[PDB]
């Protein structure tokens, strides 16, 4: 049918306010829920309905700053929320020591990302500390972990590392040669990219891999023309009407972005069928509460609401800003970031 | 011990064993964003968790507190880390923890933290004897669970348990020949044991796949495996393949077959074959067949492929 823009704006507004205890399992990643909402409002050109200054202070209260003795550099970055009980501090005073307080790579990424969307200039971000923390997360095989205490490692975090280095406009945060090696080794026999070597290729990891290379500006240099053609074939085969993440799996709204954005980066999204994709995405739209779901007649959530909108954006939906397919922010925001980088270079 | 929903449950704030600890509250400042509202019980457990965590108390009471924290939210990675610290400090029975995590994962098979916890345990015990059977059970609730397949490959690789996997794969492919995860597993086993360079193995596999394709011609997974094990050696180097496929076209046709053919013809043009101008037309004819009637949803893609072949071989 049609895009209920105002309804989606209210939906994101609610997300930034208060959630039911049934969402307690998102506690440690509240910052990424905030990102979905803010970036979502940005994409609909409605950031005006929120108090940018209040939110910026909240975000800065999530930064893990280096202590007086700077003995915790390997653990700096951002927290997903305040669940540890550390006293509110919007990056004003120095870091308060705590045996288990450290950043999370996906939170450092969405955190910096949110600050830029809100207009902040990142002056209160301890760039060197963040990059130090990032370096500490990389493994021998080139991939990354989410936290210094240890976690699983895969393509998801390689993408996070890439976005962080790109936004801070400094690649000292990683050993790019090893990361590229990891990305190459994840290519499957069917030509898609998996979470890691030998694993089943997947739409999510393919996006993470390709987007990471584009952010490093080395797509052409890492994959041959023959290889890129095979990857393109794998990606475009994902469209059934909407998109699925793996062969023989049911379509899911968020893949309209994961795969769609990959196709855009490979410059062949233009050859996909727009109408069937748009029709599928809209069929998952909740006309009553707003937002989108993974499947039609299913409950909506912040993740699918955001990615469904970015999916629509890829096709230039009337009323939605153009999304930067590799950085995952609006192109308007990516432009402001370009200016920010230029200003630093003085 | 004392279950969260037991009629005699008591808040930690009212327990004598916890009288000496001051609970630590969470504070999102003046204007909280994406704030989750918590019940009395929830906030009570975590207010004490914060306290114990903040003082790095390696006690038996702290260990029991994590069990409650996990029941309230198994996605809190910090809680799992601290529990591992305690498992070591108190030298707990890891065989018992295996039973615990085995139950937890069954209730939440799509949680990242629980799979990571089990992997750390197995590394500690250096004991994979339970793994393959456990994963097979989980794969029974969802045969495509990415977490399960990921764990299964880690185990097999780490403890070299290749002996029966190819048989397990054959069994699952009979249950659902369309499960893309199983085809990937098959390639995983073979390339890590015999490899595909052994002409006897390559033939066995190409034959096996053609048999599955004959049973269900419309299956991207089977076609992707077939092209996968041959694309690097060179599709045009297999003359009998081109004809065996052209013979299937009549009955077992599908866009996957037509696509395979286009790819064969292109390999030929790439290797300066005989009848360059004629082969190119056999390809273009197929591309248009895909665009206009076989894979219409990708109409513009196939036409783009066609235009690419012409400007490259003319």
């Amino acid at each position: 049918l049609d895009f209920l823009r105002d309804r989606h704006v209210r939906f994101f507004q609610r997300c930034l306010q208060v959630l039911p205890e049934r969402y307690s399992s998102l506690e440690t990643s509240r910052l990424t829920i905030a990102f979905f909402a803010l970036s979502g409002l940005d994409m609909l050109d409605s950031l005006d309905v929120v108090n940018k200054d209040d939110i910026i202070e909240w975000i800065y209260s999530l930064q893990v700053l280096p202590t007086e003795d700077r003995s915790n550099l390997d653990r700096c970055g951002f927290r997903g929320s305040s669940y540890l009980g550390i006293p509110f501090n919007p990056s004003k005073n120095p870091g308060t020591a705590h045996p288990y307080d450290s950043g999370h790579i996906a939170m450092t990424y969405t955190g910096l990302s949110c600050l830029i969307i809100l207009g902040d200039d990142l002056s209160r971000v301890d760039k060197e500390a963040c990059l130090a923390g990032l370096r500490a997360l990389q493994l021998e095989d080139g991939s990354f972990c989410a936290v210094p205490e240890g976690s699983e490692n895969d393509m998801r975090f390689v993408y996070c590392a890439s976005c962080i280095c790109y936004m801070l406009n400094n690649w000292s945060g990683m050993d790019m040669k090893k990361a590229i090696s990891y990305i190459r080794r994840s290519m499957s026999y069917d030509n898609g990219l998996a979470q890691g070597a030998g694993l089943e290729s997947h739409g999510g990891s393919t996006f993470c891999g390709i987007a990471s290379l584009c952010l490093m500006g080395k797509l052409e240099e890492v994959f041959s023309e023959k290889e890129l053609n095979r990857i393109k074939r794998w990606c475009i085969m994902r469209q059934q009407n909407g998109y699925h993440g793996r062969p023989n799996k049911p379509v899911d709204t968020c893949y309209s972005f994961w795969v769609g954005a990959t196709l855009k980066l490979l410059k062949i999204f233009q050859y996909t069928n727009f109408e069937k994709n748009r029709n599928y995405i809209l069929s998952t739209q909740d006309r009553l509460v707003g937002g989108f779901a993974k499947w039609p007649d299913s409950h909506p959530d912040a993740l699918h609401a955001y990615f469904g909108i970015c999916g629509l954006s890829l096709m230039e939906e009337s009323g939605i800003c153009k999304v930067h397919p590799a950085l995952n922010v609006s192109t308007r925001t990516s432009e402001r970031l370009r200016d920010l980088h230029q200003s630093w270079k003085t | 011990f004392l279950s969260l929903d037991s009629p005699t449950y008591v808040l930690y704030r009212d327990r004598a064993e916890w009288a000496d600890i001051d609970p630590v509250p969470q504070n999102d400042g003046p204007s909280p964003v994406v704030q989750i509202i918590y019940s009395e019980k929830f906030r009570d457990v975590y207010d004490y968790f914060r306290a114990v965590l903040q003082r790095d108390e390696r006690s038996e009471r702290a260990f029991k507190l994590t069990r409650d924290a996990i029941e309230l939210n198994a996605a809190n990675y910090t809680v799992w880390h601290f529990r591992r610290v305690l498992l070591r400090s108190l030298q707990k029975d890891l065989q018992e923890e295996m039973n615990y995590i085995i139950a937890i994962i069954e209730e939440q098979p799509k949680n990242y933290q629980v799979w990571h916890h089990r992997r750390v345990l197995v590394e500690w015990l250096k004991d994979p004897s339970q793994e393959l059977e456990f994963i097979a059970d989980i794969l029974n609730q969802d045969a495509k669970n990415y977490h399960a397949w990921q764990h299964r490959q880690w185990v097999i690789q780490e403890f070299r348990l290749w002996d029966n996997e190819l048989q397990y794969v054959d069994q699952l492919l009979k249950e659902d020949v369309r499960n893309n995860s199983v085809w990937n597993q098959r390639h995983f086993v073979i390339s890590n044991t015999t490899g595909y360079s052994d002409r006897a193995v390559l033939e066995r596999e190409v034959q096996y796949t053609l048999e599955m394709i004959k049973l269900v011609p419309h299956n991207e997974s089977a076609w992707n495996y077939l092209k996968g094990i041959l694309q690097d050696r060179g599709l045009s180097r297999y003359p009998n393949l081109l004809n065996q496929l052209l013979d299937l076209q009549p009955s077992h046709s599908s866009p996957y077959l037509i696509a395979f053919l286009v790819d064969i013809y292109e390999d030929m043009l790439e290797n300066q074959c005989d009848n360059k101008e004629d082969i190119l037309n056999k390809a273009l004819e197929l591309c248009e067949i895909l665009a206009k009637e076989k894979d219409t949803i990708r109409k513009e893609y196939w036409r783009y492929i066609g235009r690419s072949l012409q400007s490259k071989h003319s």
Binding site: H304 | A75, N111, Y112
Partner: peptide, 6 residues
Amino acid sequence: TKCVIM
């Protein structure tokens, strides 16, 4: 129902 990515 949902997509847990972390």
